[PDB]
Amino acid sequence: LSKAELTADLIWLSANRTGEESAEELNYSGCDLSGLSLVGLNLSSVNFSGAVLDDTDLRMSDLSQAVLENCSFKNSILNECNFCYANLSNCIIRALFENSNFSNSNLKNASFKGSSYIQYPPILNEADLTGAIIIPGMVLSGAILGDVKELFSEKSNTINLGGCYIDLSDIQENILSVLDNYTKSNKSILLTMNTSDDKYNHDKVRAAEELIKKISLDELAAFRPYVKMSLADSFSIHPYLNNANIQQWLEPICDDFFDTIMSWFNNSIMMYMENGSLLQAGMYFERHPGAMVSYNSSFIQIVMNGSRRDGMQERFRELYEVYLKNEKVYPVTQQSDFGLCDGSGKPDWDDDSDLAYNWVLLSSQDDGMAMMCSLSHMVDMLSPNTSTNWMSFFLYKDGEVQNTFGYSLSNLFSESFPIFSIPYHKAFSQNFVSGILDILISDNELKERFIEALNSNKSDYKMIADDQQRKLACVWNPFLDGWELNAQHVDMIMGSHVLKDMPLRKQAEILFCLGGVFCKYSSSDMFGTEYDSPEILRRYANGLIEQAYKTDPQVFGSVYYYNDILDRLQGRNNVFTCTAVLTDMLTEHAKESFPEIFSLYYPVAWR
Structure with a gap:
């Protein structure tokens, strides 16, 4: 009947469902239901055999146990639909199937061409995919692929897996787009191959030898790090690991990719690898004993990783025991x-x-x-x-x-x-700056002012009023000797055993940054104003700076810059300069002369 007629009976069926309905009441077969949106209706066990549901929205809809045999879905939205135990044989399914559930569904001879998902793939656990056309990215966990019928395929947009067909027509006509488990999992043929049950293992190897034929030396010439890692992850495991052909194809590729990885990561902590990649890394050191020494830290981490990895432990211990023989x-x-x-x-x-x-x-x-x-x-x-x-x-x-x-x-x-x-x-x-604060400020509430202030670029808490100054004077007077740091306090700072152990140059640069820190606290953005900055903080900053000059004057670059800083901190030669400006003069110099130290010691929210 009428579109509005055939529709109203559906939503009203759904709103008044019994679960004991009759054929007549449920026979919506042959019906053309194109264009409509059955969003989250109860259509369990309903018959749509031979119907037409192109461009329809069934999101959240319950088609469980429904017979949609020989039904067409073209550009329809299936997200989150329940298709458990439903009949879907010989269907045309070009659609979005986000988290669509096909568990126990009959999908014999159905076609999935043009379908897709973003993050959550459809569910095919124990569904019947014999003779069905699937697409890369589909996760075949527990699928029923059917028995092999034609070992190798003839079509060139198609690879045979068991008794179904993986269609390669909608892959942006670029085979690289289906070889990335890290950034394009939802489009990955490798995922589709490696999540099919073991009973299809032999069928995995075949499909793999067919896939590699579709990959050109030119397509693999770039760095292609995600793609390489996926090939090594997906193909250096059983059942592919015993296949001479597959391994031979992999070696020149992995050998190139891993040399780059071992090189780039040398003297950095090493990335985490899935099994296949890890084994390739080990195989790389096997073929190049020299790399064991040349990229020693990557080698050691790789071996520590592999020598604890179920299935390769022994091979990695032998690798290490070879390195132990090194001169x-x-x-x-x-x-x-x-x-x-x-x-x-x-x-x-x-x-x-x-x-x-x-x-x-x-x-x-x-x-x-x-x-x-x-x-x-x-x-x-x-x-x-x-x-x-x-x-x-x-x-x-x-x-x-x-x-x-x-x-x-x-x-x-x-x-x-x-x-x-x-x-x-x-x-x-x-913890170096909070540690300096621990030494300086016994009053927890005050200290907590300075510590919290590290977190932000600006502060509304000002320290210029009389009482505010008096309190600063009391805290810092033990530590100050005019514009210099008190001797005892210098010993307390320089005395840290790890600090004392650093080379002088580095200690001077650390003191410099610390001067920066207090000049900043005193600035108009922080504890000071655009009119006044708390003289105690200026004096401390200046003591730090002087101390840095004693420790290693080279850190200032020129005695002229050094005196420029002292001039502005102390107001010498009638130079009266706010510490906002001074703070930038200091950090600009640190960034340029000792960017590593500056980055580690100057608080990050302040730079």
Whole structure:
């Protein structure tokens, strides 16, 4: 009947559903229902066999147990529809199927061409896809693909998987668009291949050898990092791992991609890898023993990762035991404290404590330094606590054990084992300013003013009125000697054992930034105004700055700049300059001469 007629009976059927309805009342077969929107109606068990539902909105609608056999869906919205146990054989389905549920649904000979989802794929658990056309990105978890009928396909926009067909016509005519599990998962053929059940494993390998034919050397010439990582992840696992062809195709590609990765990441903490990528990384070191030394820190992290990964542990331990034979590492393996501690020079592969001295790190420069340490303390050094112990490793020079107390740890790390330099300096720096505040301000409420103020660029809390000055004078008088820092207080600051351990140049740059910090507190944006800045903060800032000049004058660049700062801080030569301006003169110089330090020590919200 009439469109408005056939519609009204549907929504009214839905609003007054029994669940015992009769054929006549439910026979909507052959019906042309194009263009309408059955949003979230109860159509369970209804018959639409041979109907037409093109350009319709069924979002949230309940077609469970419904027979839509030989029905057409073209440009219809199916999101979140319940199709559990429904009959959908021989359907045309070009649509959005976000989270659409097809569990136990009959999808024999249906076609999915032109369909898509953004994030949540349709559900096909135990659905019947025999002879059906699917598309890349569809997740085949528990699907029923049917038995193989034609081993290899003839069509060129089509790859055979079991008894269904993966259509390659709607892929932006670029096969690269279906090889990315990281950024284009919803379009990935690799996902579609690797989420089909094991019973189709043989069918996975075939489909894979067909896929690689559709990939040209030209398409793989770019860096293509997400694409490469996906190929290595998806194809260096069973059932592909035993296939000579597939592995041979992968090797030149992975070999190139991993050399870039191992190179780029050297002396940084290493990314996380899925199994396939991890194995390729290990296989890369197998073919290039030199890389074990050249990119030592990436190698070590890769081995630590692989030697604990179910299914490759043994292969990775053998890899490591090869590196242990290296001329520079061998001497370390003979130390009584190495690995098993039994003279075998073998690691301890069965420590649940992770406290066995298994890991040997070679210097990054020609000084013959080596480090021996546990996985436990290394994992801890790479992501440090305030509790972290930074002296838990053994140190060797040319095979001879060193006392680490004879070395500046800061230098040891920055020059020889740079993997630790940032974790180490960042760990001291990040509490450095609140720590100065702890020393300075016993009154928790005042201190909390300065500490909270670190979080923002501006402050409405001003410290210029008489009482406000008097309170500052009382806090800072112990620490000030005119415009200089009191000797005892300098010792309290410079006395930090990790600070004392840094090279002078760095201590001077840290003091400089600290001068910056107080000049800033005193500025019109913060505790001062556009008329006045609290003289105590200026005096402290100036003491810091002077101290930085004593520690290492080179940090100022020229005695002219240095005197310029003193002039403005102290109002010498009748130079009267607000500290807003001065703050920028100071940070501009830090950014230019010591950007790393400046970045670690000057508060981030202030820059």
